[PDB]
Design a protein around this nucleic acid. Structure first.
Lengths: 330, 417
RNA sequence: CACAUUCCAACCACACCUGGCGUGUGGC
């Protein structure tokens, strides 16, 4: 039987996604489940099946504790001083040997455990490999655009997910196109696809500029703020700590060429490079531009800003659902 | 309406046009069926439709005309052609066809061809009186390809080095031997820019097999040429499909008296795809390789030649080494004595950030006397004799450092004396 | 120009192996 175990551990399909010690622990867990299904009672068994060459030599766990419930895995602290245990937990002794690791039900449960383990393997591997590209934009065709979320093929058995809440009624989907974003959260302890990528976050566009805008990335300029009402308005507020560059003149390109390109990349969303100031007053003055404001007031105890607008430029002051204001408050 | 017009449009413009037509939301689905549905509408109300592409013959007798922007893929964009055309104009695998199309009628989903307007940019009458490909009389390299632009920028010098390391001409077989992380990508990029700038008359094609989509995207919009590629998220079927289609297109085009030059990177990945797509014939080599799995890659590489009757076909395929597998070495050893233009890129120089890392001592070109004049080739011989006793890194150091100040290659030859 | 044989959202199409039997020759 040991020869078959060695053949199995050697001829695994994914030698890179399922490392050798992982095969060892998977076989150990499978044999543990087999031995559990063997006896009528509930007794957990560790295997440690001679990792390199030899066969199995099982054990018997006993869980040192003053309890008695399920006495198969019970050893009281007072009645444990023999065998030189002397401890309070970890009495995994070799009281049990002579397991059968090949019969029908054992082989079936071992195949099932192996499937679960290779799935867990693939998951952890793809997640902790493609998680390095969390701040930078990822590429890849979609697996399937379901209702609650969409799943995207990032490459060799590589998968990501984009949630439904971050989607748009006008943003448009079917298996086979590639939609990008920013990997915003990774939950490696989940039960399935755990590579969560969003598209509505502001820093997205910032990262986007880091691919196109050469002024950003070298710290010579400073992209500070990004007000993003997805589908409505995506404005950016940058700052220049140097003394030979313009905040809006350089990053705009040549009469709406690079900003228009990244707008079409973001979905044709209206993008206006705004210039924030060191004070919130001029900041909200510029965020609601081009328009006039009859009153700018700041309130700290209320955590609010009163912006009263004059009449004459309403068509540029409110817009749709107060979008020109909705970014500022956001 | 032309198909290539909607082809060169981005997806956003197709979405805007579909919304201007007032239909069901088209932005939801593939660019493929996006173009399909907008064409169906505009052809329900519109002129004769026009289209263009490359033809592939099916085992049913009919043929499919596909686009290179979709890298010759199957989909609703394809144009159905009947075997009656393949009897009348005797169509062939890889013919560049452009003609009139119509919507498919009841029960059909593929646009039907009406009348061939241009076959391989040429007359159908003149499409009969043509010469067969292997029936041609191959020859050595007769006309040399000028890669030196004469401006001497930061990257152009790279091409200049080639002009003194291994001269290339129409009909020559180029094979690049380089380990990973050696700078071959922008090497081919600079070469393609130079040969597209110096020779806008010869149709230039590149091939990327199992490449990352980032390089594919940045290449398909920076150089001239039908930049066709094959990303690794598809099986070997698609890769061998691109191989077939573009090699047949190049074959037909040189048969039409045109100089075609094919850029492949890399030949080892394409050969691996060939191996994993070809059925096993019983004979295994070291590393799971079939003996028959190299037959079609050898055909693909040897298709290039210099025709006496007219036109030429030059292939430049790159090979990978030093990456650990068995297949890489067996393939590179099988392909070593095949190409007549070796270009060796040693990683030992690239590790020192000396670009381009070119093994000048282990590189060369056979029959190089038919590309340069007597004094040019003599200066090449004298410089090879000068630089050969030197090592590898110091050799490229001296080469690049002395080509940095002088700006034309013949001036470099003069100053080297 | 012309025949035209299409890469084939729920799902109709992808269902089954086996016994005892038979051939030829001879007999009245």
């Amino acid at each position: 039987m040991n020869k078959e175990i060695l053949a199995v551990v050697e001829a695994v399909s994914n030698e890179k996604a399922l490392p050798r010690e992982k095969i060892f622990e998977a076989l150990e867990s499978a044999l543990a489940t087999a031995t559990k299904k063997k006896y009528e009672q509930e007794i957990d068994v560790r295997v440690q099946i001679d990792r390199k060459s030899g066969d199995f030599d099982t054990f018997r766990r006993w869980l040192v504790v003053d309890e008695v419930t399920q006495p198969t895995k019970e050893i009281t602290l007072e009645a444990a001083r023999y065998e030189d245990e002397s401890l309070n937990l970890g009495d995994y002794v070799e009281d049990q040997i002579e397991s059968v690791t090949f019969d029908r039900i054992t082989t079936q449960t071992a195949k099932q455990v192996i499937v679960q383990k290779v799935r867990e393997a693939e998951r952890a591997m793809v997640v902790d490999q493609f998680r390095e590209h969390e701040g930078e934009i990822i590429t890849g065709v979609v697996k399937k655009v379901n209702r609650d979320n969409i799943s995207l093929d990032l490459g060799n058995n590589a998968e990501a997910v984009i949630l439904r809440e971050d989607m748009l009624p006008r943003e448009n989907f079917r298996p086979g196109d590639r939609v990008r974003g920013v990997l915003y959260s990774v939950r490696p302890e989940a039960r399935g696809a755990q590579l969560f990528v969003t598209r509505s976050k502001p820093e997205m566009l910032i990262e986007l500029f880091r691919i196109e805008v050469p002024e950003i990335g070298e710290e010579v300029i400073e992209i500070k703020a990004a007000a993003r009402d997805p589908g409505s308005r995506a404005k950016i507020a940058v700052k220049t700590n140097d003394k030979r560059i313009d905040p809006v003149g350089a990053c705009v390109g040549m009469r709406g060429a690079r900003v228009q390109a990244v707008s079409t990349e973001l979905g044709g969303e209206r993008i206006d490079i705004v210039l924030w100031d060191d004070n919130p007053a001029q900041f909200v003055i510029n965020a609601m531009a081009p328009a006039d404001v009859a009153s700018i007031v700041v309130d700290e105890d209320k955590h609010t800003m009163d912006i009263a607008v004059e009449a004459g430029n309403l068509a540029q002051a409110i817009g749709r659902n107060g979008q020109n204001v909705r970014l500022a408050s956001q | 309406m032309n198909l290539t017009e909607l082809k060169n449009t981005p997806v956003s413009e197709l979405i805007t046009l579909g919304e201007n037509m007032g239909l069901e939301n088209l932005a939801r689905m593939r660019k493929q069926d996006i173009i399909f549905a907008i064409l169906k509408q505009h052809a329900k109300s519109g002129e004769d439709i026009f289209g263009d592409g490359v033809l592939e013959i099916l085992q049913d007798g009919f043929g499919f005309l596909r686009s290179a922007d979709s890298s010759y893929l199957a989909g609703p964009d394809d144009i159905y052609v009947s075997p009656s055309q393949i009897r009348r104009f005797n169509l062939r695998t890889g013919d560049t066809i452009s003609g009139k199309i119509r919507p498919p009628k009841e029960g059909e989903r593929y646009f039907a061809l009406l009348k061939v307007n241009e076959v391989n940019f040429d007359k159908p009458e003149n499409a009969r009186n043509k010469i067969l490909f292997e029936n041609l009389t191959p020859l050595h390299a007769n006309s040399r390809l000028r890669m030196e632009r004469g401006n001497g920028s930061t990257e152009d010098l790279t091409a200049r080095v080639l002009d003194l390391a291994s001269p290339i001409g129409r009909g020559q077989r180029g094979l690049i031997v380089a380990p990973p992380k050696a700078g071959k990508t922008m090497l081919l990029q600079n070469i393609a820019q130079s040969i597209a700038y110096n020779h806008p008359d010869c149709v230039l094609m590149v091939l990327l097999i199992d490449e990352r989509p980032e390089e594919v995207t940045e290449m398909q919009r920076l150089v001239k040429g039908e930049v066709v590629a094959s990303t690794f998220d598809e099986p070997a079927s698609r890769h061998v499909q691109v191989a077939e289609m573009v090699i047949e297109k190049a074959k037909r085009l040189v048969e039409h008296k045109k100089d075609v030059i094919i850029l492949l990177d890399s030949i080892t990945r394409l050969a691996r795809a060939y191996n994993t797509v070809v059925p096993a014939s019983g004979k295994v080599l070291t590393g799971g390789v079939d003996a028959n799995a190299l037959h079609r890659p050898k055909r693909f590489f040897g298709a290039a030649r210099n025709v006496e009757e007219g036109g030429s076909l030059t292939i430049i395929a790159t090979a990978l080494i030093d990456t650990g597998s068995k297949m890489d070495e067996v393939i590179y050893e099988e392909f070593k004595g095949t190409g007549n233009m070796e270009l060796h890129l040693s990683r030992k120089i690239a590790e020192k950030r000396v670009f381009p890392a070119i093994d000048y001592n282990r590189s060369g070109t056979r029959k190089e006397e038919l590309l340069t004049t007597q004094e040019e080739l003599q200066k090449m011989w004298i410089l090879r004799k000068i630089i050969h006793p030197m090592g590898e890194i110091d050799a490229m150091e001296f080469l690049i450092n002395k080509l940095a100040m002088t700006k034309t290659n013949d001036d470099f030859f003069e100053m080297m004396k």
